[PDB]
């Protein structure tokens, strides 16, 4: 049971503070942004210390959000698609994007990138945002035939 909405606001009463309301297995309990803290004994010891950890996490998340924006704006996603001079044979899943994310040396879960099935042809582009205050943009360069 998460108790800290760390560094992010999930569009509800949970705010950047040690407070959150139960929302079940959703973006409020499956996303690692809401970091779980020891609940067996959370009165004075872990409480304020985790609040300070949350403040420091806010600051380092601004820093790492800038860093990751630069990273994914310099080394970006690349993919190829099969064409016959204007003949749609496309198929897109987020699996490959997650695989590339893991290949970048960090175990990024299935939460940064998510999209539906798409069927297209030619040159296109898809961008997925990552942050709420210093948000980054993805560049998925697709190579047609």
């Amino acid at each position: 049971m998460k108790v800290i909405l760390k560094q992010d606001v999930s569009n509800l009463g949970k705010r950047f503070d040690v407070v959150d309301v139960k929302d079940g297995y959703a973006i409020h309990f499956l996303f690692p942004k809401k970091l779980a803290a020891p609940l067996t004994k959370k009165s004075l010891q872990d409480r304020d210390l985790f609040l300070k950890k949350q403040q420091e996490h806010y600051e380092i998340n601004k820093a790492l959000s800038h860093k990751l924006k630069e990273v994914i704006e310099q080394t970006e996603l690349h993919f190829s698609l099969k064409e016959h001079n204007g003949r749609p044979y496309g198929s897109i899943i987020t699996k490959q994007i997650i695989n590339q994310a893991h290949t970048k040396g960090m175990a990024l879960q299935k939460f940064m990138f998510k999209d539906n099935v798409r069927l297209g042809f030619g040159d296109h582009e898809i961008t997925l945002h990552i942050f709420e205050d210093t948000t980054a943009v993805l560049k998925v360069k697709v190579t047609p035939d």
């Binding site: 099969k82 016959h84 003949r87 749609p88 044979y89 496309g90 099935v117 069927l119």
Partner: protein, 285 residues
């Protein structure tokens, strides 16, 4: 085309007819062609556990089921060459040995409109709307017949794929997705607009009238002798045996179990495409 069967017997008669199978199917002198061969094991209506599951079905010879590729997606951008129209011992439809020019062969359904030799392309591409071809429904306007079409992503061509089957296109929904197809048997579905389409009714439109005549043809065709409910064992059957055979009771005759099937809605609604249904001959979805 059909052909009469004169038994020339001294006792009994036969008005039975059989499709010639020489102008609609190749290699009448059937020798197993060892290019795409698959041995078939069977239990005689029994199951993997071993006990029977389908009564009144057995006593059939061996079959060599051709490797049918319902997806039509293995090899794209090269049109296939229909080598022959082959028999299918498991289906009423006639299989088609196509061979793409890249160096591979497969088996498909060739509907009425094309025969051996036609160059058919496989793709999600806006290719020509011809029998044997496969293309998404988005390129086909309303008022066309469609067959050999699936419901689920890469689930294999399952629905409406027999002789004389068709799917009338009647536009799409108000949401712009789930195109409405009027399938066979007077049912209607909300087919995905992205699914492929093998247009054209399956060949052999004359496969509608036939007289079995002799039991061997019937027993080898799956349907084994069907026993009437009159004059059975009074055990395991609540109407058999006894002097003065009893007329059948139990209004809307049930199957010989605790279940009912006569007239009652016995549809299954727990699948991955049950939200794409329109009409099932009695109600909605």
């Amino acid at each position: 085309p059909i052909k009469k069967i004169i038994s020339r017997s001294n006792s009994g008669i036969h008005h039975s007819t059989v499709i010639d199978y020489k102008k609609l199917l190749t290699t009448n002198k059937n020798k197993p062609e060892k290019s795409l061969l698959v041995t078939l094991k069977k239990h005689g209506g029994r199951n993997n556990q071993g006990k029977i599951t389908v009564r009144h079905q057995g006593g059939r010879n061996k079959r060599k089921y051709r490797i049918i590729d319902f997806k039509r997606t293995h090899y794209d951008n090269i049109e296939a060459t229909v080598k022959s129209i082959e028999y299918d011992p498991n289906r009423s439809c006639f299989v088609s040995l196509i061979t793409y020019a890249n160096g591979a062969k497969s088996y498909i359904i060739s509907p009425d409109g094309i025969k051996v030799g036609d160059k058919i392309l496989a793709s999600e591409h806006p290719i020509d709307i011809k029998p044997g071809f496969s293309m998404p429904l988005a390129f086909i306007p309303e008022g066309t017949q469609v067959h050999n079409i699936e419901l689920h992503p890469k689930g294999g061509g399952q629905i409406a794929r027999s002789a004389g089957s068709y799917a009338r296109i009647l536009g799409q929904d108000e949401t712009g997705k789930y195109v409405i197809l009027q399938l066979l048997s007077g049912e209607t579905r909300k087919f995905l607009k992205e699914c492929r389409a093998t247009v054209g009714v399956v060949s052999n439109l004359d496969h509608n009238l036939v007289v079995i005549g002799k039991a061997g043809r019937n027993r080898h065709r799956g349907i084994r002798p069907t026993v009437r409910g009159s004059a059975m064992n009074p055990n395991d059957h609540p109407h058999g045996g006894g002097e003065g055979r009893s007329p059948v009771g139990r209004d809307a005759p049930r199957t010989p179990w605790g279940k009912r099937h006569m007239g009652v809605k016995t549809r299954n609604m727990k699948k991955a495409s049950t939200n794409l249904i329109i009409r099932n001959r009695k109600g909605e979805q």
